[PDB]
Amino acid sequence: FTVTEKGWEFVWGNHPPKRFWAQETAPGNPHGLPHEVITHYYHRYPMSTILGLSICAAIATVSVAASTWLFCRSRVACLTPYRLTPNARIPFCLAVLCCAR
Amino acid sequence: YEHATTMPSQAGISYNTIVNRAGYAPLPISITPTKIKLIPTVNLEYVTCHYKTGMDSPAIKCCGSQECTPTYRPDEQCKVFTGVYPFMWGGAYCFCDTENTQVSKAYVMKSDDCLADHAEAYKAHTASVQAFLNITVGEHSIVTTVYVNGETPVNFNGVKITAGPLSTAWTPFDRKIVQYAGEIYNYDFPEYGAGQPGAFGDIQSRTVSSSDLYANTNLVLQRPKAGAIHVPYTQAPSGFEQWKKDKAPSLKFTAPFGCEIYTNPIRAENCAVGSIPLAFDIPDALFTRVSETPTLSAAECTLNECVYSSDFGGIATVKYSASKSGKCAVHVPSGTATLKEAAVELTEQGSATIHFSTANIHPEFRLQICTSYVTCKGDCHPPKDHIVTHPQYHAQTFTAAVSKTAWTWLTSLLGGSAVIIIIGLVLATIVAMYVLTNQKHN
Amino acid sequence: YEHATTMPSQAGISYNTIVNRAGYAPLPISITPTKIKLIPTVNLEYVTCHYKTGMDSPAIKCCGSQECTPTYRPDEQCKVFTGVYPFMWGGAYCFCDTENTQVSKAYVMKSDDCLADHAEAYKAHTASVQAFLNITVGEHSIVTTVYVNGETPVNFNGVKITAGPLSTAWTPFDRKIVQYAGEIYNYDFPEYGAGQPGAFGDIQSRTVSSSDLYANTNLVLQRPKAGAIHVPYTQAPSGFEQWKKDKAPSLKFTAPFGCEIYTNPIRAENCAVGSIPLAFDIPDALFTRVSETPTLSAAECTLNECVYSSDFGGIATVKYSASKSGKCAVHVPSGTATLKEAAVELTEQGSATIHFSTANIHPEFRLQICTSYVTCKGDCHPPKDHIVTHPQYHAQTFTAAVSKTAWTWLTSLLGGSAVIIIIGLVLATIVAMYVLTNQK
């Protein structure tokens, strides 16, 4: 049987009722090695963990993608006025920073 | 002094609080609920039992013809049979071959054991909650049956307490109830006069001694065997016995929230649902002044034991200094820790050892002792039992067990991405301004 | 066979209807409510009565001192007075000048006439309407108490009738009720233990013989007169007497909808509110074939007299030619006019007289005699009494008393304007076409 924190009770024949109560001793260690905290909060709070990891992965993916997008647009906006000149003498500091030729 | 609070609807567990008048001594209040009933308004309709087909002796006339004289007994069948040559032990009964006549007459009456073996069909609605509180307000304790409608006060020592109505109108009992043998069932019994043959209520006596019972038991008289004096019938079996053979289990074993159904008043017990609000009309005489109670100076709190078990598995230790030796209240204003005792008796330079209960992994609460606030901080550890035989003595706060390591993983992988996007936005702004500065040249 | 109908909740006035099975004989139904009760669930909280301040005899110690011994009696006071010089008829009692001591003890107890003179404070909720009907279904007539919840059927001759619940949860009673001497009051009494002196419920005994009463009567002990053995006291006067002096009138005088408050149990009777739905479960054996009943040919209805009064003030004569002599149903389908009787016995060539009742100045209602349908048409006249002592036997149809002349005035003033505006619009269209023709 599955016993939660809200209680559980059985009666075995002519015996009196036995009530039981679950308490929060989940397998894992919540203090380090971050694949151990995820199993701990998965056996502890199963529904909330998948939603939390989904929204944290989504925000991390959107943030890394938008930062790469803005950095590549700013590199293009820097190097384009020095790549339309027919001599193309890009200076040295922008060559080291913007990773030019 | 009007003080309102709220108590959870759960027996056995002591509920503690204090009242802080802004310039006086704190007044501790303790309420421990013992037995919380729920008594519906119960309305008897009918009882039922086993029936007992009574049969009159066969009226026999030799070379004659009988008639059917009714009696208006319940389900009273009667029929007249012709062409009968009955026998007694001392030979034949008539001399006529044909044109003899035997009358069968049967009726339904209720059984002889109806008094001690019957089932009561009721109707219930609009229950009434009633608790056995054990209140202590300023070391003056009473034990009184309070009623928990929004009125009907309990009065003691000038203090008026009105424990208001439950936050939920839930009852375990349905609109219809059958009581049999000390146990109570949610059965949809048919109405009086609607009793069907072969099922519950084929007999419907209005009370136990009503002497007017409705009976619909599918009784049909049959023709007697040639040469015998008997009354043969054929009816559907006892619907009360067939109800007893099926009998989906009692409400004692099936009730939600763990109720405890009892019999002699039909009532439920200790249904852990809802919450009782409270009103305290406290007179001004009980508020003792400040300087008639001890008051600490230079106190400090440390945690000896800290286990986030179900009961009082934490010990905080307070080293204090105060220039009196008396008792004073302790309380935790948040629901972070649930203390065990409500008062601590003090020396002038000793230490205090309190017992609290908590769900937190890193407990940081602000203990209120006599009139001051210390901060008790530590780290709790998981308990050793998976399953205990007592309920919970604390409240699971949302974000209670978040374990500072995981606070660090949520701060870095979610706040650091914001740092990435703001330095990307700053870099984009500087690039746009530098492009506009380069095209200022013409 | 399910036949659903709805009866107005009003005692005494008969209700008649018929079941029109499509190929069988019409089946008459006649239901006359006699007494419509309305019973709330009623819960006793306490009783109250006049009180009686009990006094103890004064305990005098000659040149000593006394103490207070509590007897825990209700509202009990015990003050002890020093410096007394009491007296009997045989001279002085003590012989000292000072330092004598007298103990006064007073307490409240409920009166000796509590059993036959007291107010019972109840709580009411969740009424349960119950009705004494008188039901005739196809010359099977019973008289039987019904319970008008949506179940608990009444059974006679295989017919199963169930009176549905009221369309209104109205009760004349409030949440709190006081009974005093056959009369019932919506009165907001204080709770038990919440009684105040000088008002209702300063004395609160849980039952009549409870032997535990709550007394809050503002009893104060005073100091006795020099040279007198008595217990003086001051207290607020009796609130049951002051409540009898106030007593806004009973609920049988102030209740709406004509209700009649009685108390053998606490109930209202004959309130004219709401309406009872009915449910008929008619078996298939009561339906006689058509050919075993009379059936008419060439029937005609003429109105002899016609008064749009409140009682039956209209006489219609129906001349028929019957195939067979027997009683059959008469009924009006609409609420246009309400007949008096539910059945008419026929000869073979006679002329029948029916009594009806209408609010219409110009009634045109279609009667239903045995299986045919004649059209009764005529004109009614105003009655002569302004005020009658019996309620209304018919229904108030909207636009029932329009009095055909005013139909003509409304139709002229409402139709001539529409005629003028449509001929104006047609004239505008013709003028526009004539302009477009002339501009060629």
mmCIF file of C-alpha atoms in Angstrom, chain B residues 182-343:
data_model
loop_
_atom_site.group_PDB
_atom_site.id
_atom_site.type_symbol
_atom_site.label_atom_id
_atom_site.label_comp_id
_atom_site.label_asym_id
_atom_site.label_seq_id
_atom_site.Cartn_x
_atom_site.Cartn_y
_atom_site.Cartn_z
ATOM 1 C CA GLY B 182 -24.651 -0.394 15.750
ATOM 2 C CA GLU B 183 -23.357 0.362 12.244
ATOM 3 C CA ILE B 184 -24.563 2.969 9.784
ATOM 4 C CA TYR B 185 -24.858 2.659 6.000
ATOM 5 C CA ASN B 186 -25.465 5.100 3.158
ATOM 6 C CA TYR B 187 -28.260 3.147 1.500
ATOM 7 C CA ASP B 188 -30.937 4.529 -0.824
ATOM 8 C CA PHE B 189 -33.918 2.804 0.699
ATOM 9 C CA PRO B 190 -37.342 3.105 -0.956
ATOM 10 C CA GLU B 191 -39.993 5.338 0.562
ATOM 11 C CA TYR B 192 -42.873 4.159 2.712
ATOM 12 C CA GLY B 193 -45.304 2.338 0.478
ATOM 13 C CA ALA B 194 -42.674 1.952 -2.252
ATOM 14 C CA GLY B 195 -41.120 -1.244 -0.902
ATOM 15 C CA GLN B 196 -40.269 -3.826 -3.515
ATOM 16 C CA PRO B 197 -40.350 -7.627 -3.224
ATOM 17 C CA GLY B 198 -37.024 -9.319 -2.670
ATOM 18 C CA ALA B 199 -35.085 -6.238 -1.562
ATOM 19 C CA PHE B 200 -34.661 -3.937 1.409
ATOM 20 C CA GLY B 201 -37.955 -2.699 2.756
ATOM 21 C CA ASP B 202 -40.404 -5.277 1.462
ATOM 22 C CA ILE B 203 -41.736 -5.048 5.002
ATOM 23 C CA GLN B 204 -42.222 -1.431 6.074
ATOM 24 C CA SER B 205 -43.411 -0.980 9.641
ATOM 25 C CA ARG B 206 -43.655 2.694 10.568
ATOM 26 C CA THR B 207 -42.264 2.130 14.053
ATOM 27 C CA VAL B 208 -41.296 -0.958 16.035
ATOM 28 C CA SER B 209 -44.731 -1.096 17.694
ATOM 29 C CA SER B 210 -46.760 0.518 14.909
ATOM 30 C CA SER B 211 -49.193 -2.419 14.411
ATOM 31 C CA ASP B 212 -49.758 -1.328 10.797
ATOM 32 C CA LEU B 213 -47.103 -2.559 8.357
ATOM 33 C CA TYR B 214 -46.846 -2.254 4.599
ATOM 34 C CA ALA B 215 -45.874 -5.527 2.948
ATOM 35 C CA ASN B 216 -45.201 -6.318 -0.718
ATOM 36 C CA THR B 217 -43.605 -9.779 -0.686
ATOM 37 C CA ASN B 218 -44.891 -11.304 -3.986
ATOM 38 C CA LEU B 219 -47.034 -13.871 -2.175
ATOM 39 C CA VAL B 220 -49.008 -16.250 -4.430
ATOM 40 C CA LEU B 221 -51.150 -19.117 -3.149
ATOM 41 C CA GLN B 222 -50.807 -22.506 -4.824
ATOM 42 C CA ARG B 223 -53.054 -25.508 -5.238
ATOM 43 C CA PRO B 224 -52.709 -28.165 -2.513
ATOM 44 C CA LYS B 225 -51.487 -31.663 -3.249
ATOM 45 C CA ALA B 226 -54.247 -34.211 -3.866
ATOM 46 C CA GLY B 227 -54.971 -35.792 -0.503
ATOM 47 C CA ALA B 228 -53.299 -33.425 1.938
ATOM 48 C CA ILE B 229 -54.285 -30.626 4.294
ATOM 49 C CA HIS B 230 -51.760 -27.811 3.861
ATOM 50 C CA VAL B 231 -51.535 -24.264 2.539
ATOM 51 C CA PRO B 232 -48.905 -24.051 -0.216
ATOM 52 C CA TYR B 233 -47.523 -20.627 -1.133
ATOM 53 C CA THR B 234 -44.667 -19.198 -3.191
ATOM 54 C CA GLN B 235 -43.092 -15.833 -2.405
ATOM 55 C CA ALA B 236 -39.880 -13.941 -2.945
ATOM 56 C CA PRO B 237 -37.313 -14.420 -0.158
ATOM 57 C CA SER B 238 -36.571 -12.009 2.679
ATOM 58 C CA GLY B 239 -35.224 -8.794 1.233
ATOM 59 C CA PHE B 240 -33.773 -7.980 4.640
ATOM 60 C CA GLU B 241 -31.734 -11.173 4.540
ATOM 61 C CA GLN B 242 -30.699 -10.439 0.958
ATOM 62 C CA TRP B 243 -29.672 -6.946 2.052
ATOM 63 C CA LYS B 244 -27.617 -8.565 4.813
ATOM 64 C CA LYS B 245 -25.896 -10.921 2.380
ATOM 65 C CA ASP B 246 -24.752 -8.098 0.125
ATOM 66 C CA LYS B 247 -24.024 -5.163 2.520
ATOM 67 C CA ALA B 248 -21.266 -2.996 1.083
ATOM 68 C CA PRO B 249 -19.201 -2.208 4.199
ATOM 69 C CA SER B 250 -20.174 0.227 6.933
ATOM 70 C CA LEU B 251 -19.472 3.916 7.089
ATOM 71 C CA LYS B 252 -17.140 3.079 9.989
ATOM 72 C CA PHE B 253 -14.624 1.684 7.473
ATOM 73 C CA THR B 254 -15.313 3.767 4.351
ATOM 74 C CA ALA B 255 -15.676 7.343 5.572
ATOM 75 C CA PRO B 256 -13.430 10.074 4.148
ATOM 76 C CA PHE B 257 -11.068 12.111 6.357
ATOM 77 C CA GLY B 258 -10.881 9.278 8.883
ATOM 78 C CA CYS B 259 -14.177 9.683 10.696
ATOM 79 C CA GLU B 260 -15.355 7.431 13.517
ATOM 80 C CA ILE B 261 -19.059 6.693 13.113
ATOM 81 C CA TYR B 262 -20.964 5.817 16.287
ATOM 82 C CA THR B 263 -24.451 4.697 17.099
ATOM 83 C CA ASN B 264 -26.670 5.805 19.994
ATOM 84 C CA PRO B 265 -26.588 9.346 18.895
ATOM 85 C CA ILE B 266 -25.796 8.975 15.198
ATOM 86 C CA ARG B 267 -22.601 11.007 15.049
ATOM 87 C CA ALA B 268 -19.162 11.143 13.473
ATOM 88 C CA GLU B 269 -15.961 11.747 15.389
ATOM 89 C CA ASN B 270 -12.668 13.459 14.766
ATOM 90 C CA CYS B 271 -13.094 14.159 11.070
ATOM 91 C CA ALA B 272 -9.897 16.054 10.288
ATOM 92 C CA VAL B 273 -11.402 18.643 7.954
ATOM 93 C CA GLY B 274 -12.014 22.366 8.165
ATOM 94 C CA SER B 275 -10.864 24.776 10.819
ATOM 95 C CA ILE B 276 -12.511 26.371 13.856
ATOM 96 C CA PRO B 277 -12.276 30.161 14.217
ATOM 97 C CA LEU B 278 -12.293 31.662 17.682
ATOM 98 C CA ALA B 279 -13.368 34.915 19.313
ATOM 99 C CA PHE B 280 -11.901 35.988 22.650
ATOM 100 C CA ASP B 281 -13.643 38.788 24.527
ATOM 101 C CA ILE B 282 -11.036 39.262 27.255
ATOM 102 C CA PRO B 283 -11.675 41.694 30.132
ATOM 103 C CA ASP B 284 -9.037 44.293 30.905
ATOM 104 C CA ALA B 285 -8.308 42.904 34.383
ATOM 105 C CA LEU B 286 -6.240 39.964 33.121
ATOM 106 C CA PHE B 287 -3.631 42.170 31.422
ATOM 107 C CA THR B 288 -0.837 42.251 33.985
ATOM 108 C CA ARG B 289 1.661 45.101 33.651
ATOM 109 C CA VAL B 290 5.199 44.648 32.325
ATOM 110 C CA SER B 291 7.234 45.115 35.506
ATOM 111 C CA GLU B 292 5.224 42.477 37.393
ATOM 112 C CA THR B 293 6.748 39.822 35.079
ATOM 113 C CA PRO B 294 10.400 38.974 34.355
ATOM 114 C CA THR B 295 12.113 40.579 31.381
ATOM 115 C CA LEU B 296 15.346 39.358 29.851
ATOM 116 C CA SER B 297 18.499 41.238 28.950
ATOM 117 C CA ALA B 298 21.336 39.801 26.811
ATOM 118 C CA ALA B 299 19.737 36.530 25.717
ATOM 119 C CA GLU B 300 21.050 34.155 23.046
ATOM 120 C CA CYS B 301 19.620 31.038 21.366
ATOM 121 C CA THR B 302 21.472 27.914 20.174
ATOM 122 C CA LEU B 303 20.175 24.662 18.652
ATOM 123 C CA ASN B 304 21.249 21.401 20.263
ATOM 124 C CA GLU B 305 19.185 18.848 18.341
ATOM 125 C CA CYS B 306 17.427 19.462 15.049
ATOM 126 C CA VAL B 307 15.544 16.655 13.295
ATOM 127 C CA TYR B 308 12.629 17.502 11.018
ATOM 128 C CA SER B 309 10.614 14.532 12.249
ATOM 129 C CA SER B 310 6.881 14.550 12.850
ATOM 130 C CA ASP B 311 6.884 15.232 16.599
ATOM 131 C CA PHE B 312 9.055 17.527 18.756
ATOM 132 C CA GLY B 313 12.423 16.565 17.348
ATOM 133 C CA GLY B 314 14.221 19.859 17.860
ATOM 134 C CA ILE B 315 15.784 21.344 20.984
ATOM 135 C CA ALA B 316 16.707 25.013 21.203
ATOM 136 C CA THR B 317 18.672 26.332 24.160
ATOM 137 C CA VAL B 318 18.429 29.904 25.428
ATOM 138 C CA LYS B 319 21.015 31.382 27.771
ATOM 139 C CA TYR B 320 19.468 34.437 29.388
ATOM 140 C CA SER B 321 19.793 37.046 32.122
ATOM 141 C CA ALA B 322 16.877 38.710 33.915
ATOM 142 C CA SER B 323 16.384 40.307 37.321
ATOM 143 C CA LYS B 324 13.454 38.149 38.476
ATOM 144 C CA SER B 325 12.697 34.447 38.845
ATOM 145 C CA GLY B 326 9.286 33.692 37.367
ATOM 146 C CA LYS B 327 7.518 32.068 34.467
ATOM 147 C CA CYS B 328 6.943 33.751 31.126
ATOM 148 C CA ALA B 329 5.438 32.741 27.809
ATOM 149 C CA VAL B 330 7.305 31.484 24.764
ATOM 150 C CA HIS B 331 5.894 31.564 21.245
ATOM 151 C CA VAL B 332 6.996 31.396 17.615
ATOM 152 C CA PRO B 333 5.040 33.999 15.591
ATOM 153 C CA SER B 334 5.493 32.279 12.245
ATOM 154 C CA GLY B 335 4.440 28.701 11.600
ATOM 155 C CA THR B 336 8.096 27.819 11.148
ATOM 156 C CA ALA B 337 8.455 26.010 14.474
ATOM 157 C CA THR B 338 5.695 24.601 16.661
ATOM 158 C CA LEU B 339 6.774 24.788 20.288
ATOM 159 C CA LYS B 340 5.875 22.130 22.833
ATOM 160 C CA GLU B 341 5.266 24.045 26.062
ATOM 161 C CA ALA B 342 3.691 27.469 26.416
ATOM 162 C CA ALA B 343 5.718 28.796 29.366
#
